[PDB]
């Protein structure tokens, strides 16, 4: 079935974390994004996913740091107001889904794989059908032209994802 | 040594997640908190921790839902503008710390245990000493008089914590 990510009720989250000086985890989120996805429990190879993110909506709960994350030193949102992820391959791996796709971030497109898992699906208390998932992945900062070094412990960023979809059609 | 949680550079996060209809994970965060902590790597029994959280600063990236979280139906911030955590016992459990303490949430004080771990410690690029930790815990909603039911899969909330301290004295 085809699904629409629940942006209206915001039961979708694109979070992330990366170490700070190798001393602690720095958490953040991208508050403005949307997307769709096809989920067929019997035929996993037919699954799809297409999401758009407005990178300017990054939030790590610090005005100054975020102003810096939007700068040309990092996300460079003025030049690339958007990050985008489109699947190219999906394959069932036991009780999980390995989602391979093209990530266009900071001007560069490179394939990244996410490990997703069905949390639950079923009826809506309002007459709709839903399906939610949790996912993980990593992004090597250098691969997407983000040169500003953050230390040996901070070369890649952990992606903590969770989306609830509303069945379409 | 005594530490002051880095609220200035906000290298501290009090996050949480709970399921939505057993379909997906709903993430949130408390943007306004402060605190201190004593860390002695050799004598873990002397460790302390005291944090204050302005519950009104809750954020799940949805204005409506958050207005509801502040309401009498949940956090009841108008009556109780603050949550508070004071350790009462700390003991080394192998390579981690089990921090027991009193949590005053929504008017009720009950002991909750956190499982923390040292991420790293060392010198500052600015001449200070730091030590960061990651921690986990669970809060049973009913225990703290948060009656409004969210379903069988949503009885307790996952606490995802990370704090970096700046050595005092
Ligand atoms: C097919 C099917 C059935 C589907 C199931 C449903 C699913 C699971 C579909 C997937 C859904 C979604 C939304 C998938 C999204 C996938 C992807 C790959 C999204 C891309 C997200 C994205 C925009 C990546 C950006 C991540 C990055 C690079 C974050 C920046 C982190 C960063 C630099 C932090 C800086 C850290 C640091 C120590 C800064 C120091 C610092 C600087 C200045 C002042 C103070 C200070 O402390
Ligand atoms: C000792 C030493 C060396 C220290 C190491 C360093 C450490 C690790 C020190 C600890 C540092 C800190 C900060 C420790 C903090 C500890 C604690 C226990 C903090 C308490 C935090 C707190 C305020 C708890 C609140 C959690 C709660 C109850 C969240 C509420 C969310 C809730 C009910 C969820 C809504 C879910 C739901 C399905 C909503 C319904 C709904 C309504 C409307 C629209 C949409 C919708 O979905």
UniProtKB/Swiss-Prot annotation, chains A, B:
Q: Which InterPro entries match?
A: Lipid/polyisoprenoid-bd_YceI, TTHA0802/YceI-like_sf, UPF0312/YceI
The record's subcellular location field reads: Periplasm
One GO CC term of this entry? Answer: extracellular space
Keyword terms of this UniProt record: Periplasm, Signal
- Superkingdom of source: Bacteria
A Pfam family of the record is YceI
- Family, per the entry? Belongs to the UPF0312 family. Type 1 subfamily.
Q: Which PANTHER family match?
A: PROTEIN YCEI
Name of the protein:
Protein YceI
